[PDB]
């Protein structure tokens, strides 16, 4: 009659000191391991950059001024040059002969074509380019359309080309661009629209190859008259899917899931079901918005969605994020001495060089690769270890009875 209490005393301590660890299991806890090391090889990121000015003044034709003149605030609602014009009398004449629609027959007009043709040409802006002593050409830049207009992406890596790498830190083993923003080609600003800009220079974004560029929201700036240094540090974050975390691709418009991809997606669907068209920089296969559609539907609907609406788009957290810690710095260019030299080399005035020339150095530092990853704190393996150790006693007692 004591054996029955040696079996009940054995079964008791089994579940009694066992149920305390299974509750910790169904909590689905997660440890976040950190590791900041230096990789022997480093997959250099994609570098998308855009000019703040959207359309070249010398590329805007009479027909273009007719279709998108009002959108660019170069014309009023009645196809006339606004009286509020604030330009010199030299561009006024050139612009008036262009706004002369007497006996003019409007040819067909396409926005995507306008951006592509009237946009800034990487072949004129790129005065110099290197990547690890390797000289690169405009053919290394993949054309990408975004809110700013016709932009470009170095080391885009999609399309059949392999993504570049770097194995050493410092400027010597990174991207170095010398651009000519061409202020002389900047459109006159006579009004305030989503296609006009008070600023001069470029907007840049450093992102993973498989992450679409949201350059108008998440980009940084680079000004003319300065050589900008950008020390970067690649940070890779990994999250756990639920039951452990909140993270988680539909593959509707983009290959990999990205917060940006998700937003670009929502912006597109929204702008489509509101205007029955998409903006030049948007995915999908909807009719491209016309200059008129931009002013009266496209721009407004998009601005509202992004700046005012917080109900429509609900983007979940990605299970894989690649973040680049940027550290900027600059020096003046040109020096009082090298000015007259750069002026002759590019057949420009000395003053011009100071207002237009730009140099950008994007690279990594010594410590270049950091990882913040969520690991499963308590897995099934280790669970059965301690709970399994209590079985050897319940089995040995189940025989004596």
Partner 1 sequence: DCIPKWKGCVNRHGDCCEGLECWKRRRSFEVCVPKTP
Ligand X SMILES: *[C@@H]1O[C@H](CO)[C@@H](O)[C@H](O)[C@H]1NC(C)=O
Question: Where along the sequence are the contacts to ligand X (CB under 6 A)?
Answer: 208, 210, 238, 320, 322, 347
Closest of 165, 157, 174 to residue 40, by C-alpha: 165
Distance in Å, CB of 209 to Cl ion, minimum: 22
In the region spanning residues 117 to 156, those forming contacts with a second copy, defined by CB under 8 A, are 130, 132-134
Q: Is 162 in the site for partner 1 (CB under 8 A)?
A: no
Q: Is 297 in the site for partner 1 (CB under 8 A)?
A: yes
Q: Is 292 in the site for partner 1 (CB under 8 A)?
A: no
Half-sphere exposure of 95 (CA within 13 A, CB side): 22
Residue with Cβ nearer ligand X (210 or 355): 210
From 75-83, 92-100, 152-160, 188-196, span contacting a second copy (CB under 8 A): 188-196
Give the x/- contact pattern for partner 1 in 317-356, rule: CB under 8 A. ----------------------------------------
Q: Is 164 in the site for partner 1 (CB under 8 A)?
A: no
Q: Is 107 in the site for a second copy (CB under 8 A)?
A: no
As a residue count, the chain comes to 401
208 contact choice in partner 1, ligand X, a second copy, none (CB below 5 to 8 Å, kind-dependent): ligand X
* Pair of tokens at residue 303: 């601005």
Residue with Cβ nearer ligand X (231 or 258): 258
Distance in Å, CB of 272 to a second copy, minimum: 20
CA distance linking residue 112 with residue 118, whole number of Å: 10
CA distance linking residue 193 with residue 398, whole number of Å: 83
Q: Is 127 in the site for partner 1 (CB under 8 A)?
A: no
> Residues before each break in the chain (C–N > 2.5 Å)?
248
CA distances for 157 relative to 108, 142, 154, 387, angstroms: 35, 9, 8, 50
Residue with Cβ nearer partner 1 (36 or 199): 199
* Interface with partner 1 (CB under 8 A), residue from 35, 113, 192, 273: 192
Distance in Å, CB of 350 to partner 1, minimum: 22
Closest of 214, 224, 212 to residue 125, by C-alpha: 224
Q: Is 163 in the site for a second copy (CB under 8 A)?
A: no
CA distance linking residue 369 with residue 234, whole number of Å: 5
Question: CB of 158 within 8 A of CB of 37?
Answer: no
Q: Give the DSSP H or E segment for 315.
A: none
CA distance linking residue 213 with residue 47, whole number of Å: 9
Spatial neighbors of 247 by CB under 8 A, at least 6 apart, are 239, 240, 241, 316, 317, 318, 319
Tell me which residue has tokens 């009023």.
Answer: 76
Distance in Å, CB of 310 to partner 1, minimum: 8
227 contact choice in a second copy, ligand X, partner 1, none (CB below 5 to 8 Å, kind-dependent): a second copy
CA distance linking residue 43 with residue 35, whole number of Å: 18
From 31-39, 155-163, 186-194, 322-330, span contacting partner 1 (CB under 8 A): 186-194
299 contact choice in a second copy, ligand X, partner 1, none (CB below 5 to 8 Å, kind-dependent): partner 1
* Pair of tokens at residue 195: 């296609």
Distance in Å, CB of 295 to ligand X, minimum: 29
* Pair of tokens at residue 7: 């079996």
Preceding omega of 157 cis (within 30 degrees of 0):
no
From 96-104, 113-121, 259-267, 272-280, span contacting Cl ion (CB under 5 A): 259-267
Distance in Å, CB of 158 to ligand X, minimum: 12
* Interface with partner 1 (CB under 8 A), residue from 122, 301, 333, 343: 301
* Interface with partner 1 (CB under 8 A), residue from 93, 309, 365, 379: 309
Closest of 120, 110, 116, 121 to residue 68, by C-alpha: 110
Q: Is 312 in the site for partner 1 (CB under 8 A)?
A: no
57 C-beta neighbours (distance < 10 Å), count = 18
Exposure class string for 165-195: b at 16+ Cβ within 10 A, else e: ebeebeeebbbbbbbbbbeebbbbbbbeebb
Q: Which residues bind partner 1 (CB under 8 A)?
A: 130, 133, 135, 172, 176, 192-194, 196, 274-275, 296-297, 299-301, 303-304, 307-309, 311
């Amino acid at each position: 009659v004591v054996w029955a209490l040696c079996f009940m005393g054995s079964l008791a301590l089994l579940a009694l000191v066992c149920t305390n660890r299974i509750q910790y299991y169904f909590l689905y806890p997660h440890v976040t391991k950190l590791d900041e090391v230096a990789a022997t090889r480093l997959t250099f990121p994609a570098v998308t950059f855009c000019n703040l000015n959207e359309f070249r003044f010398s590329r805007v034709t009479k027909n273009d001024l007719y279709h998108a003149g009002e959108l660019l605030a170069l014309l009023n609602n009645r196809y006339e040059i606004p009286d509020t014009q604030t330009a010199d009398e030299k561009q006024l004449e050139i612009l008036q002969d262009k706004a002369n629609f007497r006996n003019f027959k409007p040819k067909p007009f396409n926005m995507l074509e306008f951006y592509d043709r009237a946009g800034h040409d990487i072949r004129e802006m790129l005065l110099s380019c290197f990547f690890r002593g390797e000289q690169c050409s405009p053919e290394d830049f993949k054309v990408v359309f975004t809110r700013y207009g016709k932009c470009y992406t170095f080391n885009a890596g999609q399309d059949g080309k392999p993504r570049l790498i770097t194995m050493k830190g410092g400027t010597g083993n990174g991207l170095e661009i010398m651009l000519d923003i061409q202020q002389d080609e900047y459109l006159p600003v006579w009004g305030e629209t989503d296609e006009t800009s008070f600023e001069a220079g470029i907007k840049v974004q450093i992102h993973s190859q498989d992450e679409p560029p949201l350059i108008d929201q998440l980009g940084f700036g680079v000004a003319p008259g300065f050589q900008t240094f950008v020390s970067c540090q690649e940070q890779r974050l990994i999250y756990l899917p639920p039951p452990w975390g909140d993270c988680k691709g539909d593959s509707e418009f983009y290959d990999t899931y990205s917060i940006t991809a998700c937003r670009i997606d929502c912006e597109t669907r929204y702008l489509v079901e509101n205007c029955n068209c998409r903006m030049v920089h948007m995915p999908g296969d909807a009719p491209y918005c016309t200059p008129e559609q931009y002013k009266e539907c496209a721009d407004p609907a998009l601005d509202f969605l992004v700046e005012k609406d917080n109900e429509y788009c609900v983007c979940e957290m990605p299970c894989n994020v690649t973040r680049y810690g940027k550290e900027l710095s600059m020096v003046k260019i040109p020096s009082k001495a090298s000015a007259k030299y750069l002026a002759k080399k590019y057949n420009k005035s000395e003053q011009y060089i100071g207002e237009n020339i730009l140099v950008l150095d994007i690279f990594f530092e010594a410590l270049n690769y950091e990882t913040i990853e969520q690991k499963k704190a308590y897995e099934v393996a280790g669970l059965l270890g301690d709970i399994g150790g209590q079985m050897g006693l319940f089995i040995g007692a189940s025989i004596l009875t």
